[PDB]
C-alpha cells in the first residue's frame with residue numbers, strides 16, 4: 191500500500207505569505223494529485239499530474255516533485271485558500287490519499303468573551319440539567335475551560351465543541367457543556383466557569399447563583 | 402455538465418448490507434469509469450473501488466470480499482453493495498468520475514451512512530436565554546443519527562451565529578448548540594426563533610428564545 195504522509199498536519203499563514211506543504215510517498219510514483227476540501231463538503235480536484243492546474247484553480251497555486259517527494263505551493267496566501275489539502279496517487283492499487291494538510295489563516299491574538307447559561311426550566315422538568323459556557327471570538331485555538339460547583343472542581347462531566355475558523359474575522363468559538371442530574375444540580379448554589387487563554391493576562395470567571 | 406448524485410439509506414444495522422445508487426448524467430457509463438470514495442466522520446479519505454467502461458472492477462484489498470460494484474448503463478446508474486457491515490463503515494460515501502490524470506475530477510454531494518443497530522431518536526430543544534452585546538442560543542440534545550441543521554429566524558439571521566459541531570454523549574446520542582450574539586438593546590423589540598430540523602426522525606421544532 192503506498193502510504194502518503196503529508197507535512198505538516200496543521201499550519202497557518204497570513205495573507206500574502208508563501209506556503210509550501212509536502213507529500214512524501216512510501217513507494218516511488220511518477221505523478222501526484224491534490225484535492226482541496228472545505229468544511230465537510232465534496233473535495234474538488236485541484237492539481238493533477240504533479241503540476242497541471244485543474245479547471246477553476248487560480249495561478250497562485252502550483253505543484254511539483256518526483257519519485258518519493260511532492261509538494262503543493264501557494265505563491266501568496268489568500269483568505270479563500272483556507273481548506274484541507276489532500277495528496278493522492280493513482281499509479282498503483284490501492285489508490286491512496288494523504289492524511290491532509292489543514293490550512294488556516296493567521297491573525298492577531300484575541301481574548302474570548304465569556305457567557306454562561308443556567309439550564310432551562312424546560313429541561314429541568316424532564317430530569318436533566320445542562321450548564322453551557324460560551325467562549326466567543328478568540329484566537330488562537332487553544333483554550334482551557336474548567337468548571338466549579340460551590341468551588342469544587344469538576345472532572346470528566348463536561349465536553350467541549352469548537353467552531354471552524356470563522357470566515358469573516360478568522361476567529362474560533364467554543365461551547366462547554368457541564369452535565370448533571372436534576373437532583374445533583376438542585377443541591378448546590380454557585381456554578382462557575384473559569385476560562386484560561388493566551389489573550390487574557392489573568393483567567394476570566396463567569397458564574398451564577400441558582401435562584 | 403457532468404453530474405453525479407448518490408442515494409442510500411442513511412442508517413443501517415451491522416451485519417446487514419449497505420446499498421447506494423449513484424445516478425449520473427452528462428457522460429456515458431459505457432465509455433467511463435466511476436469510482437467510490439468514503440470519508441469517516443472527522444477523518445480523511447479512503448478509496449473503495451471502481452467500475453470501468455468495460456464492466457471490470459478494481460476493489461481496495463482491505464474490502465475485495467465484502468464489496469461489489471455494478472451498473473446499468475441504460476439507467477445511468479452505478480451500484481455499490483457492501484456486506485457484513487462494521488461500526489467503522491460509518492462514513493460519508495461519494496461516487497466520482499476519473500478524468501484528468503485518472504484523478505477524481507467530478508464528485509457527488511455524498512451520503513452520510515451511520516452503522517448502528519439502534520433506533521432513530523428526535524432531539525429535545527432547549528433555549529439558552531440571555532442574561533452592549535447579549536448572547537443567546539439553542540441546545541439540541543439527545544438525537545440519533547446525524548445530522549441536524551439549525552437556522553435563526555428562518556435563514557434571516559446569519560450575522561453572528563455560531564453552530565457548533567455535534568458532540569457524542571455517554572448515552573451514545575448526539576448533542577449540539579447554536580448561539581448568536583445580538584445587541585442587548587434589541588432584546589425588547591426583536592424576536593429570535595431557532596429552526597431545528599432532524600430529517601431522519603422527521604422532527605421540526607421552532608423555539609422562541611425569551612429573556613431570563
Ligand SMILES: CC(=O)N[C@H]1[C@H](O[C@H]2[C@@H](O)[C@@H](CO)O[C@H](O[C@@H]3[C@H](O)[C@@H](O)[C@H](O[C@H]4[C@H](O)[C@@H](O)[C@H](O)O[C@@H]4CO)O[C@@H]3CO)[C@@H]2O)O[C@H](CO)[C@H](O)[C@@H]1O[C@@H]1O[C@H](CO)[C@H](O)[C@H](O[C@]2(C(=O)O)C[C@H](O)[C@@H](NC(C)=O)[C@H]([C@H](O)[C@H](O)CO)O2)[C@H]1O
Nearest residue numbers: 221239280281432433434453454455457499500501502503
Ligand atoms: C492507460 C492506462 O494505463 N490507464 C490506467 C491508469 O494508468 C495511469 C495512472 O497510473 C496515472 C497516475 O494517475 O499514470 C499514468 O498516466 C499518466 C497521467 O496521469 C495521464 O494524464 C497521462 O495521460 C495522457 C495520455 O497517455 C495521452 O494519450 C493523452 O493524449 O494525454 C494524456 C495527458 O498527458 O499519461 C501519463 C502516463 O504517460 C497511467 O497511464 O491507471 C488507472 C488506475 O488509476 C487504471 O489502471 C487505468 O487503466 C484502466 O484499466 C481498466 C481495466 O482495469 C480499463 O482497461 C480502462 O480502459 C477504459 C475503460 O474500460 O473504462 C477504456 C475506455 O475506452 C476509456 N474511455 C475513453 C473515452 O477513452 C476509459 C477511460 O479512459 C477511463 O475510464 C478514465 O475516464 O478507460 C483503463 O483506463
